[PDB]
Amino acid sequence: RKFSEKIALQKQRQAEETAAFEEVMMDI
Numbered sequence: 001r002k003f004s005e006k007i008a009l010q011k012q013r014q015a016e017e018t019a020a021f022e023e024v025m026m027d028i
């Protein structure tokens, strides 16, 4: 349960980072 919660939160954090990065690239 602990491992699965950890890897789930990291994947969400990486998805938010990708969302933020894509935003920046679209701003050129």
Ligand SMILES: [Zn+2]
Pocket: 012, 013, 016
């Ligand atoms: Zn978050």
Ligand SMILES: [Zn+2]
Pocket: 018, 022
């Ligand atoms: Zn994307």
Ligand SMILES: [Zn+2]
Pocket: 023, 024, 027
């Ligand atoms: Zn922007």
